[PDB]
Amino acid sequence: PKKVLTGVVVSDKMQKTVTVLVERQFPHPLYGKVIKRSKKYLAHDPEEKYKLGDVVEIIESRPISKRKRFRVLRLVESGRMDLVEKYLIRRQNYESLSK
Amino acid sequence: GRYIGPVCRLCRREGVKLYLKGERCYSPKCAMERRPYPPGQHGQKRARRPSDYAVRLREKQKLRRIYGISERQFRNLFEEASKKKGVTGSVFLGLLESRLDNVVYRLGFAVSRRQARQLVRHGHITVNGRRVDLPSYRVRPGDEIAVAEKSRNLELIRQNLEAMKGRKVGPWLSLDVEGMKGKFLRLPDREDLALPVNEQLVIEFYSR
Amino acid sequence: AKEKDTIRTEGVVTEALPNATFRVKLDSGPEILAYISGKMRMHYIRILPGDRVVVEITPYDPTRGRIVYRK
């Protein structure tokens, strides 16, 4: 099957593209305690149909760019910006820890 | 290869008869009946309480001495036994017994285990009608050990058979004295053997 | 093998280094840091500069002597 992922649209800032953010709650091989790691996926958005904070289902496609390999297959729930919010705050935080 | 040397010394050391002579060791000469102390310059000297390790080691030596095997071979056998299902201790001993030379000694074709080995290695021994000259050679159950036809007429073997004529083999074995055959019928056990060893100790030793 | 080789020459105690080591100037010449003998140490035999002491010296390195006898 084509790999199906579930994630929240953390960004729309490129034409016909969404930065989707997929959580993946996997148990940690050595210790066991189930980690909640997350990855950004850049996803082809044919229309700019999908706005920020949309939780979408994403499918691997032929390439349509260096680090953009996914059709947005379908929407699940929309508008849950809370989920975009945490991510955004994390991103912001970095600005601190430097020199 | 062999131990290849002074034997009743070994008997003296392990503090117990080990019968690596077969005839003399039976007689009033095993240097246990006449004398019985660990050899060399510190013989009659006080025997201080040995370590736990020490005892185990001595037991292993005893066992090894009895079956006349290069330590490596012994170790391999032990390992095999351990790998094998069934009680390692007993199974190990069974495996040891299974040795062709040892079987021959036990069947009686030769009086001494060394002698048996020698007999095997010259080609006087024949499993299942074939020259099986390998002292190592573990025999499976249901296998007929026989003196080779060309070795039946030879005097030593005849003498041994005569000695063994009437007097019993092992419970695990069968011997036909006339045709010089002898079937390794079942596989042996622990109670089936008179051994001065406590194979548990051997196991422990190997475990370390 | 244990080689009999050493030179049993005497010397003036020049200077006390640590441990019980001394730069002692011999009968013949060169000053070598010479450490005190074990025997001497055992019998507590002190040395100070301004002494004349027996100093056994090696063939391998005639630079490290050994102060043998109690002065």
């Binding site: 210790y31 066991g32 305690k33 189930v34 | - | -």
Partner: protein
């Protein structure tokens, strides 16, 4: 924060047994009740009633004890000699049916939360289902 319920309950039980309190008391829960049932049937307790302590649903847990024993250390031989949460929050523990713990080589038990319910290790093996391994008791 009271930050585990199940573990706390287990710990409460343990503490009450350590000083031979006839009956402990632990705030009620479905899961806790289930656990107690499993314990009860296995026999680590006399059983539980469910009282209302000061307004709130609470389970008395009637702790079983071995007989008053002769000699120095007159201390009634505990039946729950030791009790241990295994899947705690943080490190949660899920074991396949093959991986299900044989606690004390059979003697005491391991409580397993399964899709089939809370049930002893034995039960889990019988039904052939693993689950989240709650705790062991012996």
């Amino acid at each position: 924060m009271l930050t585990d319920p199940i573990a706390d309950m287990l710990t409460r039980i343990r503490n009450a047994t350590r000083v031979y309190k006839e009956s402990t008391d632990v705030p009620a829960s479905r899961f806790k009740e289930e656990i107690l049932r499993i314990l009860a049937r296995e026999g680590f307790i006399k059983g539980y009633e469910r009282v209302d302590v000061d307004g709130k649903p609470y389970l008395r847990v009637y702790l079983k004890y071995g007989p008053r024993r002769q000699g120095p250390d007159p201390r009634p031989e505990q039946v729950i000699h030791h009790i241990r949460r295994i899947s705690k929050p943080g490190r949660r523990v899920y074991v396949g049916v093959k991986e299900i713990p044989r606690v004390r080589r059979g003697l005491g038990i391991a409580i397993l939360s399964t899709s089939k319910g809370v049930l002893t290790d034995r039960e889990a093996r019988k039904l052939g289902v693993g689950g989240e391994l709650i705790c062991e008791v012996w």
